[PDB]
Symmetry: C2
Subunit: 160 residues, 2 copies
């Protein structure tokens, strides 16, 4: 489980906008892998009136929140070999300017209950390669049935 | 070229939120294809403080705006065989609740100048298949160099 307050500091960029959607998360890490779970709620859309359903834009936003949230305690606890040399302060300093999506793939089935849903994230085969961390990720939503998923490759620019 | 005001009616869902980004668009259509071009500007992000760059969430939002915008005058002008039976009124009534993204694929190169960029959209091999319109689409950004692209399949639920 990830401490609210670590959540809240890491997701402040979205909170100061009313767009924090991750309720709670839990994680597991190794030297080159992270695995996390989140619970999510969407009160209303920031960018459009109201579709009465998920919207793919919201899949990415929830993936972004959960991923920033999953790496935080891994960085804090120095669990990722390649990220030792970063404190949580470094990590938080790099969030906005230096953590990018290089490619992403999405699929949508039974629409999701925006009001109450969860996700599973797994990031594997991290490697250094600008000099970046490439970070292949897989995520899966559900809630009501309904499911969604991707396939996202990230680039982290500072590091180590 | 698409008439501002057709743009503005079709993109009202985002405007009433400060999130209209498509400046102007032009289109071409056949019985089963649309092709469009848009120019875009992003003043600031609705959902996050400020990354100082594109953000993939904004790729989708710009694809969504341009696609809704490209089909409008095709529906208005009854150019799409399968959509005859819809006026622009029907189209606008269905925008939010009935036009969905089933799958999407994205790629990001030199980040984009959020402040000034353009796109090319092409949608082909429409077919009926709920009963929906499946609508395979391809889009490409650029601006500063820098480029991005996808690969998006839509589902339109009312119809004909
Ligand atoms: C070091 C890798 C830490 C990766 C977690 C970063 C998630 C970033 C998601 C993208 C956010 C954005 O593009 O605004
Ligand atoms: C008839 C097909 C008309 C297609 C244009 C629709 C674009 C919809 C883009 C997705 C929007 C959303 O998911 O909110």
């Amino acid at each position: 489980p990830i401490a609210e307050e670590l959540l809240a500091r890491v997701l402040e960029p979205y909170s100061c906008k009313g767009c924090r959607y991750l309720i709670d998360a839990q994680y597991s890490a190794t030297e080159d892998s992270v695995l996390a779970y989140g619970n999510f709620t969407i009160g209303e859309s920031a960018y459009i009136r109201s579709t009465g359903h998920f919207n793919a834009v919201e899949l990415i936003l929830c993936f972004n929140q959960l991923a920033y949230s999953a790496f935080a305690p891994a960085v804090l606890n120095e669990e990722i070999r390649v990220l030792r040399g970063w404190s949580i302060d470094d990590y938080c300093q790099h969030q906005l300017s230096s953590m990018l999506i290089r490619k992403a793939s999405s699929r949508f089935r039974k629409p999701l209950n925006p009001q109450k849903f969860s996700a599973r994230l797994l990031c594997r085969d991290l490697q250094v390669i600008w000099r970046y961390l490439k970070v292949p990720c897989v995520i899966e939503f559900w809630d009501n049935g309904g499911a969604a998923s991707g396939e996202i490759e990230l680039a982290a620019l500072n590091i180590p």
